[model samples]
Target: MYDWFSEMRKKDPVYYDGNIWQVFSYRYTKEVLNNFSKFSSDLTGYHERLEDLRNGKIRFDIPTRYTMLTSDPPLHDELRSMSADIFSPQKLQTLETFIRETTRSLLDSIDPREDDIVKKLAVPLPIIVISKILGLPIEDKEKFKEWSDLVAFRLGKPGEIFELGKKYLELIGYVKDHLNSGTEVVSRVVNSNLSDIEKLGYIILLLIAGNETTTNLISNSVIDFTRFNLWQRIREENLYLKAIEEALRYSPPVMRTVRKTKERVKLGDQTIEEGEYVRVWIASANRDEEVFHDGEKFIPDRNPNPHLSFGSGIHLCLGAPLARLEARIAIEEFSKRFRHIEILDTEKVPNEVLNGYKRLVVRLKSN
Candidate 1:
């Protein structure tokens, strides 16, 4: 399964893969994502809809307000700065309470005997936690889930994109109506230059990014735990921290990010021409044998995991602190409360541009 990925890294660190070029080298990925002058996310064809976003183009032919993920310095920095303080370590410490409490509540609502762990514990927890932090009402979380599904599917046909866009637009309108009344997420952006529609768009972006990405992160852990039998040991030995780090490397949520060359440049032995698109295969690079010992296996104590789970460099996830806190707290709470958990269905895993389980059916024995 991973053979093609390994071969590509060694033979052609920079090679064309369908419409986009693939950059599999760790050194090059670090360079491309870090050096804003040489490579820009906007050039990647990933954010082709920014113009439409700015113009209020409601046709969601593509994703809009990808925000930090698809932006470069100046704008990226400015936008990121606005929310930077919100994710401070201090603020994240406060979020730990909510993360723990939320996970507990989610666990309480689930039937401990149900076989689908992903549906019960892994998927819903992140969405619920993130929705609360963004001040989105609990009643509206299912809508956010629906909206996130449409965007991630990316299989939207000609009019499908527009239809999804309309749904998104409705989501935006709903959020905008509550801006003045909601908590900090809306209150902070209310007076800013961002229009009501744009503000709502940003909120939805946070929800998708905040929910789906973390949901996959949690679900991916189930795969690693089952395959490695690490769950039982981690719990017995109190190795939850190590388990989280290993899961990050063993199965990253966001596998690759597409980038484009702003100018012709030489990478290792090959030269990439300007305007060319490159997909940074983060999953492949994270497992590069040159860096990790036993690169393919899940080592609970794998120090310096240094994986690109949230990516790296300037565009590193804006929600990293919050995301980390959420994951950590959720894992700690789950491990402490659930005495045994077993994967019942492994065939339904979802595979797409991003990697995650479609359905993780597990029997849980709670304390």
Candidate 2:
């Protein structure tokens, strides 16, 4: 797909698909993502049922405004700002030790000759970290994974709006139950100025975003490290952070995000009319030759790396700091414990929006 994206960047940086316009190239993708006024994040056009739900024609247990990914400004800013403190650098720093210990423990438990890295380590690490942060039972990590998996599944497949809504209601119920149980983070969210529905929405957002993206980040890092033959250098030079950033640029978890044009806007060589869906290919943009030298190759020490893996602008991913910390620790610990790692029978997640392995079988040799 990177090959296809490269061709698109060269030939048609901004081409219209039958349904919507797809923006490739770094500059144009960044332009579309950053210009929120011209291109709205409101996704009612794509989700027809969203308007009906918003207008009260349909009712759901979850409020539409809490769907932060699809919301426009004022509401988006308010919601994002309210939750900012919990994800602050100071707050996330406290979890660094736990992340390291958990990574070490998970690796210690794995039988290098016969274990599925995705299940044994990659997936559980993020789920457990997020579960602890959300004040949910860490023992219930499997359940959280189940719910998040459903969310990811819905995201990848189309025409499952009704099913997706049902899953969301289930998730809302689960979160509400946990709120009643109460913990520091949960209490903070509950006491915040946000409405009950909005509070629950934030919880759901953290769970899905925190779990899915981090899992992919770690898994994708392993794949990239081996693919680019960086393990030797990683062991010799301690390049975990650089390798993780390169992994993000080379194989980002969220491949594309959609924005609706607010009015007629000129993007690169094309003009997008009002209410038209514009897809920004982050994967394509990260490899734009104009911005990244040797865009096709993975360079672990690629400095000044300003990639759109976490996105840009107001909707920039809130959990990015934590995700980076988690990835850094996980990779660092894995490198220390394993002398060599081999990926087996890898299967990429069959999703247009995400790029990572759904099943990444790996065998390792302990140092």
Candidate 3:
């Protein structure tokens, strides 16, 4: 797969192969993502029409769904800052303290009979963290987990709407109740000028983006670490932070992102016409030889590692701090408590956006 990515890079970094323009290489990929003026984030190309929908009546469809990622600046900036204050430094410290406690309890309880580390740990930690931040009930973790999985993957399409639709409304209806009495974030969104649906979109976006990415980051880190037989070394050297960062670079949860050309733009030896769709491959950029030395190899102490796993540009991930903090606590405590943790077998759930495990069965032993 990487061989093909390398081929695309050398041959034509910004080649349009009929359907949509594909961008490989760190330079071009960043160019597309960061230059919002030239390449608009809104794929609908009707942001103006949709912008008005924010204050419109209840309607659940593609255009009605404009979160931070979907809307371009200054509306993007407005929405971005609304959520940013909730994830402030003081709040991060509060979350960190809780994260440590959650890690310990989760580490202490795991069973091969029931589930693997991915199911037992990776899946739940972010759900719990987001639930905590949202001021939802800790006891309802499973219910939130089920909704996160359903919404994140959209595993069942429009055909299975009744089941997923009920879950969707049920989940949002639950969140709606917390608007007034919930935490700072919940009340903040509740009182904001934005319509109910956009507010709903942002919260659900946080759950999906937060859960899938961080979940994969932790799972990918574990799989990479176990494959390299580096768990003992991690404990001995205290490389939890380095390991997760590298895993983010090597096997990012999101493989790529989409953008559309606002106007004519000059890319690497190629030109993208106005209003053309573009696919920015983050995976290619992460492993770009020009950017990373031994780009294919996993280097735990990889320096100058500027990974776009959390993404880059004005639309960089807001939940990154929480995600990193969650992953670090998870791996740090997991390795410290276990004398040995080995991957027995695994199955991957193939997803267009999410890259993670269906079942990552492993063996564990205590110190």
Q: What would the per-residue lDDT of candidate 3 be over residues 85-195, giving only the tens digit for each residue?
A: 777655688777789898888877886334498888888888888877877665576677667666342332311111245766777777676656667776776688877
For candidate 1, report its TM-score: 0.88
- Model 3: runs farther than 4 Å from truth? 54-64, 88-90, 112-115, 151-164
Tens-digit lDDT track for model 1 on 1-367? 3677788878987786556578786777777777777777764233454455557664442334345556677666766676778776687687777777778887787677876666777777777776677777667656766665654524322111112557766766666566666668556666666544445545666666566677777777767776787767887788777778778777877777766678998777777788876778888888888787788778987887888777788888877777677777777777777777776677443554567775777678878
Would you estimate the TM-scores of all the predictions? 0.88, 0.90, 0.91
Which stretches of model 2 miss by more than 4 angstroms?
A: 45-65, 153-169
For candidate 1, give the lDDT. Answer: 0.69
Prediction 2 global C-alpha lDDT: 0.77
Clashes by residue pair, model 1:
115-362, 349-358, 350-358
lDDT of each: 0.69, 0.77, 0.76
Q: Could you tell me which 10 consecutive residues in candidate 3 have the lowest summed lDDT?
A: 153-162
In model 3, what lDDT does residue 249 have?
91
Candidate 2 C-alpha lDDT tens digits along 1-367 = 8889989998999999778899889999998888988988866432434445445565444443355666667666766766688788788999999888888889878988867788888888988888778777754565567776764524422212213556667776787777857557677668876556556666677766567778899989988888778888976887777778989999899888877788998987787888787888999999998999999889998876889999999888888888899999988888888887777778877766767777888778878
The most accurate candidate by TM-score is: 3
The ten-residue window of minimal lDDT in model 1 covers 153-162
